[PDB]
Design a protein around this nucleic acid. Structure first.
Ligand SMILES: [Mg+2]
Length: 1105
RNA sequence: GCAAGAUCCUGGUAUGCUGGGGAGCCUGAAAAGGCUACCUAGCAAGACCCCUUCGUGGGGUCGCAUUCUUCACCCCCUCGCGCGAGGGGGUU
DNA sequence: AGCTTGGTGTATACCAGGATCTTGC
DNA sequence: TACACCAAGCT
């Protein structure tokens, strides 16, 4: 069904959104908007406040499980060792709570004569030290831990603070003695400082280290006279830490031999490859030109580089001593940073550094390891390269020599070079063998050995392959679904245009730094706005604010010339002129005095001045170094030191600072990854070109095309001055993408030049034949955009989460309540009955035929019946015998002998009952705990349709009308809803509005809403699909601070958000013509039932099957 | 060659929560309640694998990611000689 | 008595390195 | 953070 049309793809990438457009083109002018959709994604984020991704929380939970399992294994091993030595471990109960601490204190203070008591206290102390060993660097081995200073410096300062606070001298002041003494002397003291939460200083204030516990253990061994073998055994069993590896398939494959794994720095193949390659780059000046060096010369330099032991041969000592030339200037192509007096040659040439390190460590331990040293010197170079490949790559999960526990231990802790070079060791050897013989470079040996063509490149990642970054993977998945659907619809695109708009590769740390920085940017500007308005300024310009800030900080000082200045004597001085490669930044400006202003003369500032009279450097830069931070000004603490060192680094320039550089279309991770994947798709499908722009760019394209979002979507003006931003309406992303289908790199370069000249202040229209051709080609694009916005065609969809995977319950365990069988049972207490079989029995008492429990929470269901017996399957419950109940009347499950609340709901099943002209609706809210305890988290279950038992918290805490209707049999499941489902109320909109919602719909007549939650058994939470919560919160903040900068519509929007429409389900689903819109990847609603989620009407939905 | 970021991954730590305890203090002082700490076990529910002592309990791995679950169709990587496990896509 | 709305609890926070990029000279 | 959950107010 594919009809090939000439169409272009436009992709507007954001942090939380992506706008996607397919626009069909007739004659280099846009003809039809085939699809336009904004997709609102979470950026892969699972913790909404900490910024941690879903993958990060999954990895943290997995590693906590691995930690607990290995810790249990090592405690079992210590228990076996203590049973072997006949030492009693600390029991699980019936002991004093300071037996372990007093045991450590007694064994580290005095000698215990009784053998049984000594062994019991020793077992108690060793078991407790295994439970509380403290932290160690995980990459250090046990000997590396044992060679640390004993005790540590941190514990030494903590100990000195402990005498300075308590005036007692414990010798030796170990952590066990100190903690036990402070518990016996000041009971109820806290040993370690807690998180978050009237004041009490804790006993210790630094994190306990493993060397402190190790020092205490050996001190106990010294005082109690333990033999050294059992001391080493208890040390190895207490401090048994697993080795931090780097597991396989996480290390990149070879571009040339993709079965073979990546190679390391310390692999000798890489040092010899670096030597031969760096030799082969070098061009000897011969024949009045650059001729690459001869074979005898390259063999002499390479043989003189693989046999060294230090960084001895440098680039100034190769050209005139081995290459045999008269001049060091006769050699070129040296891949280092250039400088005067051969600054590249001043550093040292690359050499076999791993062999040097191994030779030096041999020279320090050859008497310790003669077998290794003799094997290293005498055995073959291939075998020793394999040996270093087995000692540097041993820190990988997936020891080839089978040597004993101490003959290799002198080198198991050796620190080799570390890293990952782009080729594999087999490929490095293969390309090595066709350099030192044939004298050809990597550029020829790569073709020769593996038989690849001249135009061969490392292969591009496909669209189906992930990146591992959450934001990039979300944008990538949405992009690849849109592109697959558009390719099946209208064939492959003629071109693909992308632009990213900031917000990547920063963790969203810089999000918090951006908001707390625009806070200062828009607050400290108000001071120099209002005080100059009080002065009398009537023409507001940013330059006046900049010079006012410089006067505010520098206190109106020509620092060089003296002569105190004023507002009129400002003379804003650009340190770097734009004729020498600069830009209009606030770093570049310094306040001057007239005499200290014009004398620079385009020369490097504070360099002509120091090479003259009346003025010198070395003082003012020190004053900037000791600059105290003012708490009320533009620049924050994080930008403070960076600004100060940037000012110093541009003041101390003794040469040029080039140049007038403009961005060259590839700067980010997401841009590189998306570009490579779109190039892979294009080379597999026939796309003529693929470009990835920036900015910033499409806003100016809309400005010079005169395209306004408010004229598109008829939005009200939320600000008093000017109109709203584009970021108010989410559809603007797809609008931008539609505009991105019109551009090329040339017209984008002209627009970027227009941006730099307009912000460098104007206003200036762009002049170019390409720009004029672009402007008269896409003149009708705005007409197309109007006819697309009026038809309600630009969709805003959120991707659905249908997998029944995630946190099943809340983390906090809660104590059970207990209730007697023969008392008065309320509805709440009947709802909280933990045991499902006892629960079903109590339902059989209240309603013998009813499958579900229909009780008011406040109703008194049963009285105190003192002769009530509960007949269970295996036993009988007497009227005085207690029954476990959940602590609160809300959804909870049994986990590990404790009660946990259920998590956020995975979905809500929609139930409809009654007459078709006016039916009632309810939501059965289903969480992950419901499917977990119902046995539905197994492979082969439709979790949105499969029935739940009556004892699940979904059916316990459903609405009463839903329970009665399901008992009556007139209620059927007609669909489900997930957080993110789109509700389309149609042209009618929200007819049943009440309260603030009504006045919200007076100014924002929203017909599309998004399911965001299910706050109780009768209410669904909805937010408007086309309106942005981030824009609404920045208007909320601007109402909280700025005076009357919002219109009444902005007031209503700010008061509506973020809780939005907390709606009664009856009020929502009693709207006729309300539909639940599940969209395809192109934004079109899915209305045909296949094997994908389809649009449905709660009014007109039939039951299942 | 080189200063560094981001993304995870691996190894740990200290609290916290619940169950079992209790050193000190407070109520009860007949009695067992509370608080401050500390000791100990567990810290997703669970699923698969292996024992042989066909049972009785004990060891290993996976388990909050890839947002259209499962089902069904199509493509791709590894192993199979179809198909077991991972990815992807599905137009209204 | 049922719908609007206001407030509030929720596991939490560190360390040392290693592998994929990205950079930006 | 935002969602589920707890009451008070408004009519
Ligand atoms: Mg955008």
């Amino acid at each position: 069904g594919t009809v090939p049309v000439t169409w272009r793809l436009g992709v507007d990438v954001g942090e939380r959104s992506i706008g996607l457009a397919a626009v069909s083109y007739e004659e280099d002018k846009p003809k039809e908007i085939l699809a336009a959709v904004s997709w609102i994604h979470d950026g892969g984020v699972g913790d909404e406040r900490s910024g941690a991704s879903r993958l990060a929380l999954r990895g943290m939970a997995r590693r906590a499980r691995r930690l607990r399992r290995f810790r249990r294994a090592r405690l079992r091993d210590l228990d076996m060792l203590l049973s072997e030595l006949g030492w009693t471990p600390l029991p699980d109960k019936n002991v004093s709570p300071v037996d372990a601490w007093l045991a450590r204190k007694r064994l580290a203070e005095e000698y215990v004569v009784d053998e049984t008591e000594r062994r019991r206290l020793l077992g108690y102390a060793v078991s407790h030290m295994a439970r509380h060993r403290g932290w160690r660097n995980p990459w250090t081995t046990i000997k590396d831990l044992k060679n640390l200073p004993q005790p540590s410096d941190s514990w030494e300062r903590t100990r000195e603070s402990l005498e300075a606070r308590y005036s007692v001298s414990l010798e030796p002041g170990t952590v066990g003695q100190w903690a036990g003494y402070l518990l016996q002397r000041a009971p109820g003291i806290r040993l370690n400082p807690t998180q978050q939460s009237l004041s009490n200083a804790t006993a210790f204030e630094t994190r306990l280290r493993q060397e402190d516990v190790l020092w205490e253990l050996r001190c106990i061994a010294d005082v109690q006279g333990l033999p050294e073998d059992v001391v080493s055994n208890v040390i190895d069993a207490v401090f048994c830490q697993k080795r931090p590896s780097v597991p396989a398939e996480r290390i990149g494959r070879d571009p040339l031999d993709p079965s073979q794994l990546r190679a390391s720095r310390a692999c000798l193949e890489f040092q010899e490859y670096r030597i031969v390659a760096a030799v082969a780059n070098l061009r000897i000046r011969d024949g009045s030109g650059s001729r690459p060096l001869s074979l005898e010369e390259r063999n002499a330099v390479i043989e003189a580089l693989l046999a060294q032991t230090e960084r001895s041969l440098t680039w100034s000592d190769i050209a005139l001593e081995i290459l045999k030339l008269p001049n060091e200037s006769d050699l070129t192509s040296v891949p280092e940073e250039d400088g005067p007096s051969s600054l590249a040659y001043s550093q040292f040439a690359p050499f076999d550094e791993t062999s040097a390190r191994i030779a030096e460590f041999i020279a320090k331990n050859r008497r310790k390891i003669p077998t290794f040293a003799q094997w290293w010197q005498e055995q073959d170079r291939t075998s020793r390269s394999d040996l270093v490949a087995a000692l540097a790559d041993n820190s990988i999960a997936g020891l080839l020599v089978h040597l004993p526990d101490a003959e290799l231990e002198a080198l198991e802790g050796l620190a080799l070079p570390s890293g990952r070079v782009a080729y594999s060791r087999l490929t490095l050897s293969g390309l090595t063998r066709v350099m030192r013989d044939d004298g050809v470079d990597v550029h020829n040996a790569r073709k020769t050995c593996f038989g690849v063509d001249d135009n061969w490149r490392p292969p591009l990642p496909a669209l189906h392959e992930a990146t591992g970054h959450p934001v990039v993977d979300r944008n990538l998945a949405i992009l690849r679904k849109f592109l697959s659907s558009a390719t099946m619809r209208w064939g492959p695109p003629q071109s693909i245009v992308v632009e990213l708009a900031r917000g990547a590769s920063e963790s969203r740390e810089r999000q918090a730094e951006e908001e707390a920085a625009r806070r200062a940017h828009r607050k400290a500007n108000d001071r120099i706005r209002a005080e100059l308005r009080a002065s009398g300024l009537s023409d507001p310009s940013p330059a006046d604010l900049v010079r006012a800030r410089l006067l505010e900080l520098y206190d109106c000082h020509c620092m060089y010339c003296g002569a105190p200045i004023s507002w009129e004597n400002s003379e804003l001085d650009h340190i770097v002129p734009r004729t020498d490669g600069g830009s209009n930044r606030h770093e570049n400006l310094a306040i001057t005095c007239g005499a200290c202003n014009k004398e620079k003369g385009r020369r490097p500032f504070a360099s002509w001045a120091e090479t003259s009279n009346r003025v010198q450097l070395r003082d003012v830069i020190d004053r900037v170094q000791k600059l105290k931070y003012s708490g009320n000004m533009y620049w924050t603490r994080d930008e403070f030191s960076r600004y100060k060192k940037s000012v110093v680094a541009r003041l101390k320039r003794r040469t040029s600072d080039p140049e007038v550089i403009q961005s060259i279309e590839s700067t980010g991770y997401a841009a590189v990854a998306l570009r490579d994947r779109l190039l892979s798709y294009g080379e597999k499908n026939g796309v003529a070109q693929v470009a990835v722009f920036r900015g910033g760019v499409t806003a100016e394209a809309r400005r010079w095309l005169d395209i306004s979002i408010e004229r598109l979507f008829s939005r009200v003006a939320i600000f008093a001055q000017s109109t709203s931003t584009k970021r108010l309406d989410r559809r603007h992303h797809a609008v931008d993408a539609v505009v991105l289908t019109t551009l090329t790199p040339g017209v984008a370069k002209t627009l970027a030049d227009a941006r730099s000249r307009r912000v460098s202040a104007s206003t200036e229209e762009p002049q170019s034949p390409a720009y004029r051709q672009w402007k008269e080609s896409c003149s009708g694009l705005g007409d197309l955009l109007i006819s697309t916005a009026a038809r309600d065609s630009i969709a805003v969809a959120a991707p659905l989460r249908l997998r029944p995977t995630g946190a099943l319950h809340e983390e906090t365990l809660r104590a059970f309540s207990e209730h007697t069988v023969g008392a008065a049972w309320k509805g709440a207490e009947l709802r909280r009955i933990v045991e499902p079989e006892v629960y079903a029995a109590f339902l059989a008492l209240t309603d013998p035929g009813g499958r579900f429990l229909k009780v008011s929470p406040s109703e008194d269901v049963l009285p105190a019946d003192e002769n009530r017996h509960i007949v269970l399957s295996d036993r009988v419950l007497g009227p005085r015998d207690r029954v476990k109940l959940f602590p609160d009347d809300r959804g909870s499950i049994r986990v590990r002998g404790g009660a946990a609340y259920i998590a956020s709901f995975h979905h809500a099943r929609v139930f409809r009952w009654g007459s078709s002209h006016s039916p009632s609706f309810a939501l059965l809210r289903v969480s992950l705990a419901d499917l977990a305890v119902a046995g539905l988290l197994r492979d082969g279950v439709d979790v949105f349709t499969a029935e739940l038992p009556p004892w699940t918290p979904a059916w316990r805490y459903a609405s009463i009308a839903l329970v009665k209707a399901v008992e009556s049999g007139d209620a059927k499941q007609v669909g489900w809803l997930v957080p993110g489902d789109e509700l389309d109320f149609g042209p009618e909109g929200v007819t049943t509005a009440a309260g603030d919602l009504s006045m919200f719909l007076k100014y924002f007549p929203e017909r599309h809403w998004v399911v965001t939650g299910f706050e109780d058994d009768k209410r669904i939470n909805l937010k408007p699909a086309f309106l942005s919560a981030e824009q609404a919160e920045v208007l909320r903040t601007e109402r909280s601070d700025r005076p009357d900068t919002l219109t009444e519509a902005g007031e209503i929007l700010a008061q509506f958000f973020p809780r939005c429409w907390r709606a009664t389900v009856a009020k929502v689903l009693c709207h006729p013509g309300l539909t639940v819109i599940r969209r395809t990847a192109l934004g079109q609603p899915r209305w045909r039932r296949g094997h994908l989620p389809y649009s449905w009407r709660p009014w007109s939905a039939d039951p299942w099957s």
